[PDB]
Design a binder for this molecule. Structure first.
Ligand code: HEM
Ligand SMILES: [O-]
Length: 153
């Protein structure tokens, strides 16, 4: 798990996201979709987005970014004690949305990228380490639920 010090770092970094949840959420999804176009195909509601300009101009993409980061934020503030919050997400993403765990790796990496891109020189090495641990814990606990379900993709 994470130490108390590491959790404090995670939640301090998260304050950056909370100051502009929509902007961070938008950029995370754009980084995901542009880096990994196959991910867009999991979203029937974003398939029409054929250019990054269209992605940037999409109100609905910003809205979904807010939904995604709000859910993740709720999970992070549990400091690992997130079974009730994480179980339903793991199950909707495996059974309804059919999201391979690889894509959760992609979005985790996208969050780290966006934090550096929006806050260059202000996302320190200790902060990256702590946030990375938190995202790995999130992904790993989802992975355990995926295995229960026998879900691969
Ligand atoms: C930080 C990781 C993620 C979080 C916290 C998250 C959260 C959410 C939430 C809260 C919802 C709405 C409720 C639900 O259906 O369970 C949702 C819907 C959805 N998610 Fe995610 N998600 C994440 C990653 C991903 C990834 C990587 C993909 C695809 C590559 C994905 C695809 C979808 C799809 C297709 C829906 C439904 C869209 C719709 O019907 O309008 N999610 N997600
Ligand atoms: O999502």
């Amino acid at each position: 798990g994470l130490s108390d010090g590491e959790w404090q770092q995670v939640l301090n970094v998260w304050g950056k996201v909370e100051a502009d949840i929509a902007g961070h959420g938008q950029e995370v999804l754009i980084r995901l979709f542009t880096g990994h176009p196959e991910t867009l195909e999991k979203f029937d509601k974003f398939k029409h987005l054929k250019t990054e300009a269209e992605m940037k101009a999409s109100e609905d993409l910003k809205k979904h970014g807010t939904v995604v980061l709000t859910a993740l934020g709720g999970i992070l503030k549990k400091k690992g004690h997130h079974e009730a919050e994480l179980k339903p997400l793991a199950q909707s993403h495996a059974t309804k949305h059919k999201i391979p765990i690889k894509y959760l790796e992609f979005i985790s990496d996208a969050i780290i990228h966006v934090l550096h891109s929006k806050h260059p020189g202000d996302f320190g090495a200790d902060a990256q380490g702590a946030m990375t641990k938190a995202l790995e814990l999130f992904r790993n606990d989802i992975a355990a639920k995926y295995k229960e379900l026998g879900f691969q993709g």
